[PDB]
Design a protein around this ligand. Structure first.
Ligand SMILES: Nc1nc2c(ncn2[C@@H]2O[C@H](COP(=O)(O)OP(=O)(O)OP(=O)(O)O)[C@@H](O)[C@H]2O)c(=O)[nH]1
Ligand SMILES: Nc1nc2c(ncn2[C@@H]2O[C@H](COP(=O)(O)OP(=O)(O)O)[C@@H](O)[C@H]2O)c(=O)[nH]1
Ligand SMILES: Nc1nc2c(ncn2[C@@H]2O[C@H](COP(=O)(O)OP(=O)(O)O)[C@@H](O)[C@H]2O)c(=O)[nH]1
Ligand SMILES: [Mg+2]
Ligand SMILES: [Mg+2]
Lengths: 53, 430, 432, 132, 430
């Protein structure tokens, strides 16, 4: 009954301010890794030359 | 006969050789297990070029890898095509050169070189004969810059009649990797110019420029650069391995490329490199191949070549093409770029042909042109070196293992004299 | 075949080392019991027992029993050797004279005995990482002597010190300026390199990223823990291009005397509102050199730059690094010293960073750590100058230094040491 | 700073407390979690047991509690190297550098995956010679 | 099968012997009763060395217990494992000794010694091929040094072919346990150097040594001190009861450790002894153990081994360990401590390897050493003797049983001779 003082629901002790948003639970749960992207790997490194086709 | 051995130092040389051996193995049809799996008879005719044989029928590469630190060699061994090498050949220290020439050339390298020299002597004496030494390394790293040059020096002091080929990736100022790069680069250049029979520098700046502009694949990694260096490598030795109409060994290349004793620096370029989006679109023809292999952008170094006129240039065409087309194109180009060719050495383009092409494509061309334009890299390196040396910055280490300022003065003087003598012929007229 | 000796002295070093070890433990999956639940990576910061658990290569030195007793009774009591936590009985009482001339002597000897034991167990020692807080007495006194002892005992091996200097405006003791000037002299002529981590800035880092207004010393200690990991990331994990401990003062020490630089860490954005930004390397680097990322209270803008060695950890392809160098150089706000046209030492690693469970940090896929040496570092030593000058005019608190075995003149001689160091910095910055 | 003689029932941080507490036979071992490690009175209604250290009973022969030591402690070398030619495998320790177990050896499938994908893949030789 | 017999006298001899049989009881797999509950077959083939056989399958040790007072005897059977010993003229008196050497050797001891020699002859002849005798007793105690030694003299007079071993505990000046203690010790030393082939000294004063400065237990009791002596005692016969690479029985040690007839005094020690604190974090291997054995503190005798030099030493390695490391460590330790080893005799360290270590451990070593330093032990004991004799203190008590002062001078006469003769090798040069 003390948290909702507008001083406990903000400015906590030893933890980030609880700005309650909602993550998309389908991701972010197991190993979702922030970031813009994982430097998407392109097609081929070597087969570009020596076409093998 | 007329066989060649491969000894490499530093991480850069280690990687480059690890890729070149894979390229050659693919070309000859060697599978990772070491047992032959080629198809054609000519796939085996010249297996003496780079491979020795042990009991049981498997093949091993005649390469001795040397690196002062164990991480690079350990990583290289456990990956693909790491089991072909003889572990007895491996040699390394346990300290780490720390990018310091003093450490890599006077204190640590001097003691560490004994075993490497012994194994090199054994390998050289083992087989029928010798024709040259091809060495890959970088002038910017301490361990390479020191041990590689010292090994070349001792090798020349021991063998006076065989040629030596060395490739170094000089540090272009735009993209740098070490603050003390100019010091070791200039000092190694000095130590090499006096005793290097052949050197063909490859610039990573032009590497990146080409790997962006030509192929147009957005995010190539180190693998692509290493490959292109290796393909350029194989372009110069395919002649000694396969038959044709006009063979040309490394000594012949020296004969047709080096006008004077003090001029043994070359810049190369590989073609064709077609973008995945257009490979079906570009046509395969001698005029197009020649136009590209003379294209400015196709060469491996950022030093602008149009800033001077080639002293002499030779090319090793690969594949089946009528010699007349090559000769006619060479004549036409020599006429069309007269201003870009010196006027006292007529008929200054060399030709060659090989029958069996590379793996999959039809016509392949490797370019080796000693252009007066190579002045720019040394000029920029000297420009940074003079400023770096005005305040003796970072000089206390270099003096901390016995090497004094007199050695630096001598090295800088030699490099500047080389630059002056190299610009001398640019203004020379008949 | 490579290892490092970790020496913690004083509470400041003890606690910070305490927090960092949690970070190290998780990175390799070593449980508190020491056994591995389920390649040769742990060798860098652990020593095998031959069969079973693992032990850390560290030795804790302190005089006050209380702090260590918590370590010897905490949730990680089962990690260290029972006999490597040497301790004394009487505290230094924040009077440096007690830690170097009267009391610290009786236990400094014991340190060398144990250390030579670990080194003998080691095979390829590379260097030392010693933590000492200047504002901490017991660490201050034992920091100075140890560096002198090690140099004679071992010789040419390198060493670095993650010191914790006083804040320009925030103060914890009242005689802190005295112990710094005395201690500083001990480190200039015996340590190849030192890192600046003044606690004042770290608070600023906390507010502008995490949105926290009651950080606790564990929160402050956590950030440093990741900073150390960045420097040693290459020594133990495979990568495309590595940088070694011996290759730190090869590219970061213009002259033997000038051996100080301040580091920064980023990006620091937790799961709260980190999703809203790209975190691409091109933009991550830009945050690197902003004045708000300086983990030390100084104004890089006040002066030029000598040479900065920045090591990346993550999935950054090497190419995106190159575009960064071009972007930074063209800028005009950050100006380089004249006599080092190229001074960027670029590092790359593959293993991404870790997150301690229940902490403030999140798990971002890209991480950049900067160890930059700047002429602005003279500001920190220049500002402490007035603190020493004002008090000695009236010789306040001096009477407790003369009576503990320290000669009065010791204070006078220290004045020249900092005076010369300030003069040299301005001397280097002048263009030719 | 000298060693003091035992005065206080062990549990105090006084001298020689680490060693004494290690004893399992002593009742002091196995203290209560909520004793210490207590954030607040109400978070955990009550205590819990955790145990202290993991040490043998008699100071001598401290290697007990390990079944592996028990198993190998009762074999002879003559029975360890000459057992039988049928199913005798080497046990000597080689150099680590020679047992790297290259990736190709790690996963056999990738070994055969290579080759046809790269070896003898659409190569042209039809030499332009009179004889052939 | 070259069996041995153990006879203990006096309180100290009985207590140490009580534990000695206890440790051996567990290893072979003998229950407090004597029905086999071991696991492997290695514990029955050689179970004849220390244990006989009887109807019903119960194994009963061939031990002799002997004291002039009943208290000590009643206690041993009182605790567990007291059900084993033979109730058989099982010698015990009802007069007590009262710390009077003369009392235990001439009047009281003689009237009972005849019977004890009767049974000892009985048990000894039981063995097929006798190996030797081992006796544990005390010098500062009445019954042990006095009545026990007279038994030592008799045995030699009847079986010169077998060798005798002892585990002699002598008082140390620092720790005080008796006032007439100095006398009875010197009166006993003379009587062993003439008959006993081998003597190993264990100092009850020292025994705290490892207990308090290394083992670090706050309240060790006499129960704890007994094992340490027990730990070393069981290790002397490691090869005699299990297979191995290099079997080395007792008789080997005598010729291998006693260069001269009158220098058969050794000091022993045991390792690796590590406290209950760091039981897990230290590695047990050849390098670790070998450094502990020669540390001065670890040795069981009050004399410092760095005040002189060694002549011979024995190491009984136990557990499966590679031979090369043992030999290399032995040589490495020898050279680095040349000043501590006499020069005229080369190769003054021996090795031995058994096939099985004690239960609950992987590797273990017992050290048996001969040092010219052991002179330091007697001088303090002898020094006390001279100071307290000029006043004939306590003399009248010993003169009441017919022992005449004409013999006390004789006893001290030889005591110094052993000191002088044993010493002249501390600096003798060939
Ligand atoms: N990094 C870090 N530094 C701290 C912390 N707490 C205190 N300090 C610093 O330590 C300095 C003084 O040393 P302390 O750690 O407080 O105590 P100490 O190390 O035992 O030194 P003494 O007081 O002489 O015993 C202060 O000026 C603080 O700047 C902390 O939690 N983390
Ligand atoms: N092309 C290419 N160049 C590399 C690679 N790795 C490193 N380099 C170059 O090597 C230079 C540094 O050399 P260095 O590592 O100090 O040489 P070392 O002392 O032998 O290790 C850098 O400027 C890079 O450009 C690579 O994989 N490919
Ligand atoms: N280590 C050890 N020494 C003992 C023990 N009991 C007696 N002693 C030693 O024996 C000496 C006294 O011997 P004493 O009782 O007179 O022998 P006794 O005449 O046969 O009864 C003392 O100086 C002690 O050092 C014991 O349990 N352990
Ligand atoms: Mg403190
Ligand atoms: Mg024999």
């Amino acid at each position: 009954k003390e948290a909702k003082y507008h001083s406990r629901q903000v400015e906590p002790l030893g933890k980030r301010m609880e700005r309650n948003y909602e993550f998309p639970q389908e991701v972010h749960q197991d190993n979702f890794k922030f970031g813009v992207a994982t430097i998407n790997s392109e097609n081929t490194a070597k087969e570009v030359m020596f076409p093998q086709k | 006969m007329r066989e060649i051995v491969h000894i490499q130092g530093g991480q850069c040389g280690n990687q480059i050789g690890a890729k070149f051996w894979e390229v050659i193995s693919d070309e000859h049809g060697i599978d990772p297990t070491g047992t032959y799996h080629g198809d054609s008879d000519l796939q085996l005719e010249r297996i003496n070029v780079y491979y020795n044989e042990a009991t049981g029928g498997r093949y091993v590469p005649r390469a001795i890898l040397m690196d002062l630190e164990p991480g690079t060699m350990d990583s290289v061994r456990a990956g693909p095509f790491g089991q072909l090498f003889r572990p007895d050949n491996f040699v390394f220290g346990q300290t780490g050169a720390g990018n310091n020439w003093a450490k890599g050339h006077y204190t640590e390298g001097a003691e560490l070189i004994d075993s490497v020299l012994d194994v090199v002597r054994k390998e050289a004496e083992g087989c029928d004969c010798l024709q040259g030494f091809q060495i890959t390394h970088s002038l910017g790293g301490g361990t390479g810059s020191g041990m590689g040059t010292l090994l070349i020096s001792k090798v020349r002091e021991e063998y006076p009649d065989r040629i030596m080929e060395t490739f170094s990736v000089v540090p272009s100022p735009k993209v740098s990797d070490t603050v003390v790069e100019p010091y070791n680069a200039t000092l190694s250049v000095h130590q090499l110019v006096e005793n290097a029979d052949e050197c063909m520098v490859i610039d990573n700046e032009a590497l990146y420029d080409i790997c962006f502009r030509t192929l147009k694949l957005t995010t190539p990694t180190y693998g692509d650069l290493n490959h292109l260096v290796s393909a350029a490598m194989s372009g110069v030795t395919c002649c000694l391995r396969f038959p044709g109409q006009l063979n040309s060994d490394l000594r012949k290349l020296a004969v047709n490329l080096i006008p004077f004793p003090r001029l043994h620096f070359f810049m190369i370029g590989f073609a064709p490199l077609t973008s995945r989006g257009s490979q079906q679109y570009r046509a395969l023809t001698v005029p197009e191949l020649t136009q590209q292999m003379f294209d400015a952008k196709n060469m491996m170094c950022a030093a602008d070549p149009r800033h001077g006129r080639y002293l002499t240039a030779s090319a090793l065409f690969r594949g089946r093409m009528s010699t007349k087309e090559v000769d006619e194109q060479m004549l036409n180009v020599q006429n069309k770029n007269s201003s870009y060719f010196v006027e006292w050495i007529p008929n200054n383009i060399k030709s060659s042909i090989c029958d069996i092409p590379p793996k999959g494509l039809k016509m392949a061309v490797t370019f080796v042109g000693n252009s007066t334009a190579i002045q720019e890299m040394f000029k920029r390196v000297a420009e940074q070196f003079t400023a770096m040396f005005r305040r003796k910055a970072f000089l206390h280490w270099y003096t901390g293992e016995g090497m004094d300022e007199m050695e630096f003065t001598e090295a800088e003087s030699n490099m500047n004299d080389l630059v002056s003598e190299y610009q001398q012929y640019q203004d020379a007229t008949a | 075949m490579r290892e490092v000796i970790s020496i913690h002295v004083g509470q400041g070093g003890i606690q910070v080392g305490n927090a960092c070890w949690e970070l190290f433990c998780l990175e390799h999956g070593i449980q508190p019991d020491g056994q591995m639940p389920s390649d040769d990576a742990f060798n860098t910061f652990f020593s095998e027992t031959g069969a079973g658990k693992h032990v850390p290569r560290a030795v804790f030195l302190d005089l006050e029993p209380t702090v260590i007793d918590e370590v010897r009774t905490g949730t990680y009591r089962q990690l260290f050797h029972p006999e490597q936590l040497i301790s004394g009985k009487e505290d230094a009482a924040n009077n440096f004279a007690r830690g170097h001339y009267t009391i610290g002597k009786e236990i400094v000897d014991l340190c060398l005995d144990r250390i030579r034991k670990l080194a003998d167990n080691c095979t390829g020692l590379q260097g030392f990482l010693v933590f000492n807080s200047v504002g901490g007495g017991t660490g201050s006194g034992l920091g100075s002597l140890l560096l002198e002892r090690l140099s004679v005992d071992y010789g040419k091996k390198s060493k670095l010190g993650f010191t914790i200097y006083p804040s320009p405006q925030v103060s914890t003791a009242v005689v802190e300026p005295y112990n710094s000037i005395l201690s500083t002299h001990s480190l200039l002529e015996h340590t190849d390199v030192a890192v600046m981590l003044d606690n004042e800035a770290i608070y600023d880092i906390c507010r502008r990223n995490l949105d926290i207004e009651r950080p606790t010393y564990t929160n402050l200690n956590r950030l440093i823990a990741q900073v150390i990991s960045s420097l040693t990331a290459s020594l133990r994990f495979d990568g495309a291009l590595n940088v070694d401990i011996t290759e730190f003062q090869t590219n970061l020490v213009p002259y033997p005397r000038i051996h100080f630089m301040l580091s920064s860490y980023a990006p620091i954005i937790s799961a709260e509102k980190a999703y809203h930004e790209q975190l691409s390397v091109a933009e991550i680097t830009n945050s690197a050199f902003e004045p708000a990322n300086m983990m030390a209270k100084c104004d890089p803008r006040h002066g030029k730059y000598m040479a900065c060695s920045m090591m990346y950890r993550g999935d950054v392809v090497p190419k995106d690094v190159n575009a960064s160098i071009a972007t930074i150089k063209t800028k005009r706000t950050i100006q380089f010293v004249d006599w080092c046209p190229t001074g960027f030492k670029v590092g790359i690693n593959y293993q991404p960073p870790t997150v301690v469970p229940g902490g403030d940090l999140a798990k971002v896929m890209r991480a950049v750590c900067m160890i930059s040496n700047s002429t602005a570092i003279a500001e920190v030593f220049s500002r402490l100058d007035h603190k020493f000058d004002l008090m000695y005019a009236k010789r306040a608190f001096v009477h407790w230094y003369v009576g503990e075995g320290m000669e009065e003149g010791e204070f006078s001689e220290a004045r020249e040491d900092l005076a010369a160091l300030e003069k040299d910095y301005e001397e280097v910055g002048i263009e030719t | 700073t000298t060693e003091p003689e035992k005065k206080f029932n062990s549990t105090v941080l006084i001298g020689n407390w680490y060693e004494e507490r290690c004893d399992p036979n002593r009742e002091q071992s196995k203290f209560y979690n909520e004793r210490k490690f207590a954030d607040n009175n109400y978070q955990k209604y009550t205590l819990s047991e955790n145990k202290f250290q993991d040490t043998s009973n008699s100071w001598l022969n401290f290697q007990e509690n390990k079944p592996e030591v028990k198993n190998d402690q009762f074999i002879t070398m003559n029975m360890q190297e000459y057992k039988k030619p049928s199913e005798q495998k080497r046990n000597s320790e080689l150099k680590p550098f020679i047992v790297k177990k290259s990736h190709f050896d790690k996963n056999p499938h990738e070994l055969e995956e290579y080759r046809e994908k790269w070896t003898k893949s659409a190569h042209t030789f039809d030499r332009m010679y009179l004889g052939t």
